[PDB]
Amino acid sequence: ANTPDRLQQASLPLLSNTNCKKYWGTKIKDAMICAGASGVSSCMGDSGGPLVCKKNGAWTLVGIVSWGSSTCSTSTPGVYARVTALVNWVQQTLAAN
Amino acid sequence: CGVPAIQPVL
Amino acid sequence: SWPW
């Protein structure tokens, strides 16, 4: 395997959960969002980092790198924690601490 | 938030 | 699958 010294990036598309389930079945939950299957893949060591989407001039955290193909296949969608499902938890926690 | 000072190039 |  090859680990990079320098920070990497990739553009990739969001998938719908209904379509992502054609790859991953009932593993896909509402608090997940799939992205990729596009010729790139997140991989071991990327976990916890960002999936960001740009709108109105700013990048927003839409996903957190979570899991996917055990071989980082570029034709299989990656699975990310779906930040919209989790953000009420985030703002509260920052509320309180 | 969300606006890098050093703009990313894709 | 594997944790990423």
Binding site: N2, T3, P4, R6, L7, Q8, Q9, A10, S11, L12, P13, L14, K27, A31, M32, I33, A35, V40, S41, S42, C43, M44, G45, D46, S47, G48, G49, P50, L51, C53, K54, A58, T60, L61, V62, G63, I64, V65, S66, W67, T71, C72, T74, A81, V83, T84, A85, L86, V87, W89, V90 | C1, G2, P4, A5, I6, P8, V9, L10 | P3
Partner: protein
């Protein structure tokens, strides 16, 4: 990331590295403000790990990086590690990051925001480039 490309240095200023005591990068994260990082719950972070902000080249000694102690780890109660669902942890830093050109925060969505299938987004990290 497999089949990505090298970033412009400093151009993803919320990207952090989670490193263990030995200096080993094991996960990414994102700054959401000077005191807090969002990461994956399954990364298994504790207060003996550190958040490194401001890196580009993890093999370089010439970067002005910030190696930030973690005060507490907040794993979302909803996290289910058997299904890897609700895979999110918050890290409260002991001492605030100093924001700069290369260190700053990502935006968070509202719970009601729509991110449509087919939208092109970006992911970043120091994960494997080849399995």
């Amino acid at each position: 990331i497999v089949n990505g490309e090298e970033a412009v240095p400093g151009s993803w200023p919320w990207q952090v590295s989670l490193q263990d005591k030995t200096g080993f990068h094991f996960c990414g994260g994102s700054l959401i403000n000077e005191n807090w990082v969002v990461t994956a719950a399954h990364c298994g972070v504790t207060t003996s790990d550190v958040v490194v902000a401001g890196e580009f080249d993890q093999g370089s000694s010439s970067e002005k990086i910030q190696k930030l102690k973690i005060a507490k780890v907040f794993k979302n109660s909803k996290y289910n590690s058997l299904t890897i669902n609700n895979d999110i942890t918050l890290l409260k830093l002991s001492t605030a990051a100093s924001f700069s050109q290369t260190v700053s925060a990502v935006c968070l969505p509202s719970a009601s925001d729509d991110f449509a299938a087919g939208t092109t987004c970006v992911t970043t990290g120091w994960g494997l480039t080849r399995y």
